Paper text:
Herein we describe the structure of [name] adenosine monophosphate nucleosidase (KpAmn), a purine salvage enzyme unique to bacteria, as determined by cryoelectron microscopy. Whereas eukaryotes can deaminate AMP to inosine monophosphate, prokaryotes cleave the adenine base from the ribose 5-phosphate moiety via [name] ([name], EC 3.2.2.4), additionally salvaging adenine. The protein comprises a well-resolved C-terminal hexameric core consisting of an extensive β-sheet structure surrounded by α-helices, and a somewhat less ordered ancillary N-terminal domain, dominated by a long α-helix,forming trimeric layers on each side of the core.
Ab initio models confirmed the D3 symmetry expected from the homologous crystal structures, and all further refinement and model building enforced this symmetry in the interest of improving resolution and mitigating the moderate orientation bias of the sample. The map lacks density for the first seven residues of the protein, as well as presumptive loops at residues 61–79, 156–166, 362–365, and 468–478, but otherwise possesses the features expected at the estimated resolution, including clear density for side chains. In keeping with the prior E. coli structures, no significant ligand density is evident at the active sites. The active site is composed of residues from two chains; a cleft of conserved residues in one chain binds the nucleobase and sugar of the adenosine analog, with H188 and Y189 of the apposed chain contributing to stabilize the charged phosphate group. In the apo structure as determined, the core residues expected to stabilize the nucleobase and sugar (N205, W383, M404, E405, and D428) are well positioned to do so, whereas R381 and K436 are in alternative conformations in the absence of the interacting phosphate. The surrounding residues are well resolved; weak density outward from the active site is interpreted as residues 435–443, possibly stabilizing the apo protein while remaining flexible enough to permit AMP access. The cryo-EM structure of [name] [name] primarily differs from the apo homologs in its loop regions away from the active site, either by lacking density for the loop entirely or being in a clearly different conformation. Notably, the loop covering the active site is strongly conserved, suggesting an important role in protein activity, ligand gating or structural stabilization, despite its weak density.
Author numbering:
A (entry chain A), B (entry chain B), C (entry chain F): 8 to 61, 80 to 155, 167 to 361, 366 to 467, 479 to 484
The structure:
């Protein structure tokens, strides 16, 4: 089959199933009626299934054909002009849980109606989330489970996310990014055409008020707000403010992997461990020592996490170009990651390991992001800036009086954006990439 | 010595030392002059030291005699009427780091001045923070290290904290508490006389505007805001919004232990694990299964963490009185604590342990607070409310559409406050309690 | 002191002490006489000691000033024109064991004389091998312990070793290297002037017979023969045939580190693990998975072993230039190292790890050499060539009928030598490098 037919059929089947389930819920609520157990067994509430045969056959269940349109289309056409494969679209035996299809009702229901919904209708089973080979990394019951939480943690629809992701932990970066984006949109000759903020704000070049992009209500309701800078093609920039901790940088990566991004970058601040370092110097990681106890059950510390040559070259070039000069202000080394925000009180232990690995800086998130980008096959990077010297009696705090690190906050972000630009300019494994 | 003399001498010595250090910094900045190494060796920049002899002698260095006045006074008078002890006050050989005494200058200094300050003046050494026996749990260099971060994480001065602490993780509780406090202050016959909010807002009964207590800027700048409801005696209520995670509930406890509170209470929501539980039911913990990897290096999981009979009795009585009825809406059991926000994806492992311990609920903070209250000898409690049923297909999210858990948010807080009231109504170990 | 005076004094003191000990042994053997315990306590049998003061003072005992002449001289002059330091030379309190000074006698002694030598003369104590800071990595009692075994394992004097070391495991490489060197020496315009073979053979351009360099008696007596290609300056090439196993590649590195080489290169063959690989393709390592149980007590597997950018760039350039074409014949990946020569019989276990690390090849020595070059601060590299496909039913043996891997043995060595040439063309830490 030509891929266009497959896409159209998938969309039609998914729409029919969702509409049927919505109407069944509606008339059960409003008339106390149950659905037949025979017609429902005719694949009435089931996900569409796609299979390609070329050695063997690979089948998976698709969950949102209208959101993954470009990715699915290019992956299907890449296996239709270079190999010999047959494409089949049919109905599966897995059912759509009802909490995922609520977009036209208001469940102001008492306990009896909730019990009836739980009893007579499909629900989520934890034994499910986790012709004989898988075609993609994830099935439908996991992608749909993750898309429901992306909209809750972040605050923006999942249709807006862009392929180049930046992570921060300091709100001044957010202010700088919003200002720079609002300045760039007004430029007549620029790819960007719109800005989407957390909370449901859509700013274009024809809005009377540009002074509501950064409101204080966003940090009230959403744990990890995100700002997207849309492009006409679909190649923009996304900024996510994860926070502080190695457990908040793992869940967001888990939920964000299902969109298949193109690159993850980390931009933050650390604390130097070498006497030659001065506040305001850049650190580039080429190896990570993992002291965060998360991910030790699925990826043991014996497994080595390498670096990616292309990303490091891009970061070095961007630093050289933007800084306008770098053998003394930029270092390359091993960064430590810990889940203990008060490691000083136990320093006398950690010191031993800090000597065996010849570490250069310490932070709290980079190793977890690198591990998650290794597990899900996403390119990753890191570029940190020294904010204090804990071991040499110049210890400071993020947000307090610091006139040398606050100066280099509007230039660190420029280095990150230039790295993204340079990366974009150039260019048992499941067959989908 | 009578304790009054000891208190006066401690205050005078501390004030003299702080003033001397401040003036030395000032004239070094403004005239490029250094201090003598001989007069400075006359105990010019040193903490006062207090010793009591009664078997043996105990000595510690005091850091802020005017903040710990009541505690020190009662502890010293309790050892002067029941034992035979001699009290001595002198000068120690430990020096006051300069970052702790900056309250009258503005260090808009370049790199040269910062280097000079680091070289010619006392600084923080990490080998220090961690007549022959200790008189208190902590020395001065640790109390002063913690008081500097209490003011940064929270946003309020350390002189306002109250002895009865409530922990939450859901901002609706904060809104309810602020409203109830502002309503209580206006009552002519009530112990409370003022409210102190995060960010530096002081509300009394004679303020024109009571509509600025809860602003959205607090969540922008401070990670863990706190609201205090002051009382004339010093017996009020403190509310702290720690957040989500087992690593944010450990650092705040580390920094808050040095004020010697009277009780820590935890008020939040969990996810039920038993089929008989309905959304809106109360869970009371009598044992904790610790799956959070923090604190496993200083308190191994073999050590048992018991419960406190007085606190559990108070919580049961408060629930019975406020709820106005409890053998079916209230359960007692074992709660699990995990650092993985997506445990469902790995459920098939954890299930085994969930069967061996006969668990009743799952949450993310209670076990760490209980362990920290065990280490520092502070009474602790816990009272959770079921918000979803993950294993039985009724899984929900905090902040989403939930009309049965949002109803019992103005009554859960009342149960907590009544428990605090009931607890207040009644009533190698260092000699200080 | 000017460094020349220090060198002359060190040489004179060492020569005097060695001569005194030799004569004492001689006259004890030939006349049954003992040495005085008072004159001997005048520093009569002691190592010279060198100290430099510049912050603090560093002292170490020198063992062979006439062999380390250039290294010591340049390190001492580098600290005399860039810093302020004072140089002192004196006598230490450590004694020279007699087994290290036997170069003029023949101990055809019975048991009585051996017992007398052990009793009345200094001997080796195992508590010793393993003004207040160390000036170099090793002291005299360890350097002298290692120089005695370099001459036994290898078969050549320690004065001939060159700074650029190549490791092999296949004797055909040795034959090719000997032939190429003997051809290069005869060239009138070439840096090389002599060849030194294992067993004590010295070949120059004026020898009648060039057909005795490669004799079969070398493999009889010496475990790890080495061939040196001397240069007039001191910049030549050394080839060492370590053998097979991860325990023979660790002891030779231990003993060879004390000469401070400039680069270690590994050249061997592996077994591919990817279906796209064909026999005769090159693998370049950028991360090592360590399954050899040696070195797990001094460098745990948690510590990451990075790669060196300069060496990898040189290897890539050399492959591109020599091969005369490389995106398909050259791969970059993770190599596994194991101490089990029959891993196939247990494959069903190792497979799991082979999937977590995305490995590309398997060998038996590279990871140990990389770890040893990390511990002693020596640059390291690796370039392997595929010889069989164990997992895809093309398994072969080294030395058996293989007409595609035997062709690329005279070109692999050329790539290694070109890499050495390119590296030479360009260009709590002890102060000596």
């Amino acid at each position: 089959l030509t891929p266009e037919q497959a896409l159209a059929e998938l969309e039609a089947r998914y729409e029919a199933s969702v509409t049927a389930l919505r109407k069944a819920i509606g008339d059960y609520i409003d008339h106390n009626t149950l659905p037949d157990t025979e017609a429902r067994a005719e694949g009435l509430f089931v996900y569409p299934q796609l299979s390609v045969s070329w050695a063997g056959c690979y089948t998976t269940t698709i969950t949102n054909p209208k959101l993954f349109r470009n990715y699915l289309l290019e992956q299907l056409t890449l296996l239709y002009q270079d190999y010999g494969a047959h494409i089949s679209v049919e109905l599966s035996q897995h059912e759509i849980p009802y909490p995922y299809v609520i977009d036209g009702s208001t469940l102001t229901l008492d306990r009896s109606m909730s019990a009836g919904l739980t009893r007579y209708f499909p629900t989520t089973e934890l034994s499910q989330i986790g012709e004989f080979y898988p075609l993609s990394h994830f099935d439908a019951r996991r992608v749909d489970f993750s898309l429901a939480r992306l909209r809750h943690y972040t605050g923006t629809p999942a249709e807006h996310f862009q392929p180049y992701v930046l992570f921060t932990n300091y709100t001044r970066y957010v202010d700088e990014f919003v200002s720079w984006g609002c300045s760039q949109i007004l430029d007549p000759d620029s790819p960007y055409i719109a800005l989407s903020c957390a909370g449901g704000i859509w700013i274009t070049a024809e809005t009377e008020a540009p002074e509501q992009a950064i409101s204080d209500l966003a940090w009230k309701k959403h744990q990890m707000p995100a700002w997207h800078l849309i492009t006409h093609d679909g190649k923009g920039i996304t900024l996510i403010n994860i926070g502080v901790g190695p457990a908040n940088a793992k869940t967001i990566c888990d939920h964000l992997a299902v969109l298949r991004p193109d690159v993850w970058l980390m931009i933050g601040h650390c604390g130097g461990l070498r006497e030659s370092q001065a506040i305001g110097d850049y650190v580039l990681a080429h190896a990570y020592l993992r002291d965060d106890h998360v991910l030790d059950a699925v990826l043991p510390p014996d497994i080595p996490i390498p670096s990616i040559a292309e990303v490091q070259r891009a970061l070095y070039d961007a630093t050289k170009q933007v800084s306008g000069m770098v053998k003394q202000r930029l270092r390359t080394g091993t960064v430590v990651t810990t889940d203990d925000r008060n490691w000083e009180l136990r320093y006398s232990a950690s010191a031993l390991r800090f000597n065996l690995s010849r570490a250069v800086a310490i932070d709290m998130e980079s190793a977890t992001i690198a591990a998650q980008g290794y597990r899900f096959r996403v390119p990753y990077g890191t570029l940190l800036c020294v904010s204090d010297k804990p071991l040499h009696g110049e210890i400071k705090l993020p947000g307090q009086a610091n006139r040398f690190y606050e100066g280099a906050i509007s230039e660190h972000l420029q280095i990150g954006i230039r790295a993204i630009d340079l990366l974009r300019a150039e260019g048992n494994e499941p067959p989908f990439r």
